[PDB]
UniProtKB/Swiss-Prot annotation, chains A, B:
Residues 7-38, 41-76, 80-115, 115-147 form the EF-hand domain. It comes from Gallus gallus (Chicken). The N-terminus is blocked. PANTHER family: MYOSIN LIGHT CHAIN 1, 3 (PTHR23048), MYOSIN LIGHT CHAIN 1_3, SKELETAL MUSCLE ISOFORM (PTHR23048:SF3). This is Myosin light chain 3, skeletal muscle isoform. The lineage of its organism: Eukaryota, Metazoa, Chordata, Craniata, Vertebrata. GO terms for cellular component: contractile muscle fiber; myosin II complex. GO terms for molecular function: calcium ion binding. The keyword Zinc does not apply. Keywords: Motor protein, Muscle protein, Myosin, Repeat. It comes from the Eukaryota.
Swiss-Prot record, chain C:
The modification Pros-methylhistidine is found at residue 10. Residues 38-67 form the IQ domain. Belongs to the TRAFAC class myosin-kinesin ATPase superfamily. Myosin family. Muscle contraction. Myosin is a protein that binds to F-actin and has ATPase activity that is activated by F-actin. Residues 93-95 are annotated as: Hinge. It is found in: Cytoplasm, Myofibril. It comes from Gallus gallus (Chicken). The lineage of its organism: Eukaryota, Metazoa, Chordata, Craniata, Vertebrata. The chain holds residues 747 to 844 of 1939 of the full protein. The rodlike tail sequence is highly repetitive, showing cycles of a 28-residue repeat pattern composed of 4 heptapeptides, characteristic for alpha-helical coiled coils. Limited proteolysis of myosin heavy chain produces 1 light meromyosin (LMM) and 1 heavy meromyosin (HMM). HMM can be further cleaved into 2 globular subfragments (S1) and 1 rod-shaped subfragment (S2). This is Myosin heavy chain, skeletal muscle, adult.
Curated annotation (Swiss-Prot), chains D, E:
The chain holds residues 29 to 164 of 168 of the full protein. Residues 9-39, 74-109, 110-144 form the EF-hand domain. GO terms for molecular function: calcium ion binding. GO terms for cellular component: cytoplasm; myosin complex. Myosin regulatory subunit that plays an essential to maintain muscle integrity during early development. Plays a role in muscle contraction. Myosin is a hexamer of 2 heavy chains and 4 light chains. This is Myosin regulatory light chain 11. GO terms for biological process: muscle contraction; skeletal muscle tissue development. This chain binds calcium. The N-terminus is blocked. N,N,N-trimethylalanine, found in other myosin light chains would not have been detected in the N-terminal tryptic peptide in PubMed:7358336 because it would remain trimethylated and ninhydrin negative after hydrolysis.
Amino acid sequence: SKAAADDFKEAFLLFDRTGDAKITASQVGDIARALGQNPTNAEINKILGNPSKEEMNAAAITFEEFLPMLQAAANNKDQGTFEDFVEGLRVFDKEGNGTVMGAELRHVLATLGEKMTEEEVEELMKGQEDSNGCINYEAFVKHIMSV
Amino acid sequence: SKAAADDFKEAFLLFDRTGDAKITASQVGDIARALGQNPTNAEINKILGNPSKEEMNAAAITFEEFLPMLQAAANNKDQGTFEDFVEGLRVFDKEGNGTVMGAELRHVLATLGEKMTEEEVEELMKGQEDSNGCINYEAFVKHIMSV
Amino acid sequence: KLLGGGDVDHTQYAFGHTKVFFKAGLLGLLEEMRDDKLAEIITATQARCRGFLMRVEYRAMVERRESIFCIQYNVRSFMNVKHWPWMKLFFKIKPLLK
Amino acid sequence: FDETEIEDFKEAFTVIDQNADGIIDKDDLRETFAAMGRLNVKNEELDAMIKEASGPINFTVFLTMFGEKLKGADPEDVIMGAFKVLDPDGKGSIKKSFLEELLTTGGGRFTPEEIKNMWAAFPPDVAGNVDYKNICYVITHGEDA
Amino acid sequence: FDETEIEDFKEAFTVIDQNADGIIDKDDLRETFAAMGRLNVKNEELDAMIKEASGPINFTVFLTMFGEKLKGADPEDVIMGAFKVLDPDGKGSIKKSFLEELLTTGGGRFTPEEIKNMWAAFPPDVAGNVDYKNICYVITHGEDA
């Protein structure tokens, strides 16, 4: 709305590697996340196809399509409730203390639903899981929502 | 035709070591390749013999024979299709990734058909094959068609 | 692995646990046709290679161009010099230096 | 001529010019040879060294005389550069017949007869093309080390 | 610009300004090159160095010209700082493919083509990303050491 945030246009100049002021359709998922929006990858996929837009063939972009797609994704930020994120992992391990065994969270984050690479899974556990093999998800989900 | 390319005559002065403006019949194969023509060595051999020309005895040349032999070889450049070069090596190794094991390509290029020396085989693999012993022929055939 | 080479019909045969199977005189006929067809396919694929093979030789020959010269001239010097008073002198003396 | 090689010739010029006036005369040649152990150095050897110059041996006349005799002189690091390109896998001294074929077949300076003279004081390994490195030493500083 | 780097440029300014008046003219450039061994230094090379300035080469004009060409110049201790963070376990030179992937995937300055130029004079180890340290040397002081 501007509140006209012109820093979204300045961040589009940091993600366009050619400097022509266009951003390919394959970068739009990760740049919506870097502007403070977490649409799921199936949602980013649907919307695209919904608009008869094929992410399979070469793509370019213009700021005039990327701005309204970020504004259509911005209504879905009401789905980001931290009660359900901590209660999900509280149902994932027994006893009254928030600890996932290391390999349980790593294999679930790579193979269940939207596949996260094991390189990204190791980069999200690095520091929050110590050598006991127990990830405290009270501080883990706190630090994941700090970015 | 000239398009009269007079640089073919200037390249004949770079390959004639005596400066008399003649190039021996044994150099004509490699100089057709250096002018942008890839006739196979049996083809260069046949044509020669076809014309009752013996590459076994001393030979000289004149520009007036080398020009029409380069123009007779220039029609055969329609045989250089890169689909069949990459599909040849794709049938040469299993799995869905373009990698020949090092020694498979080296022994096939030296002993199968027109014998390439192992010195030339090592000079064609140098840089494209790393220490894993796997030659990626997608980039290997790309760089071989860059010259 | 062997059958890898040859301008032969890669059809006409068939392998199995204890032996290869081979056609003649029909399958024999087939192969033959096939054989010719690879000379084509092959003969043409050879060429480029051959071509290309030498094309890399030129890139090396050329690189080498000067490194030789350097080597070339460089030696010659010495052959001339090594017999020169002044140079022997420098030689015995070259060490006392720092 | 790299600048450290010119500083080495300036230090050799100062050790032969024992009068320190900037011009090496025949007395400096004889007194430098006598300080190296040459008690019998003839005057005809000193006259043949001075007969290679058109004037007195000052620093620039000594540099131009050495320049004109060393027109293909190569420092040890550039000779080992070229021998590392001839042995691109490192460590190994290259074969005798490979250096004989590549000297001849590339250039006229690598003709055989000259290759027999290369083997002739540059011993076997050196001559053969197997060792390496001792030949770079004796091309920058002559005689057996 | 750290102050010891500015004192190094003040010492280089005094070695090229052999008249010691504070302004490097074309005669100072030619006499510094002749004292390094350049007897054939053309006047067009001296004119191209003076054509990079809008005025006489005093100490602040030499510092602003070097500042504008070295806008990403990094001292050896900060380059080794960043390479110790890339190899956080110490001692080991980092892999060739790890530096190619991390240069590209983080930044546009680490794009490949540029990575082929990095391997191209920064040799293998350096290029590969295995050794380390020789590249910090040649980024603060160029040419082969």
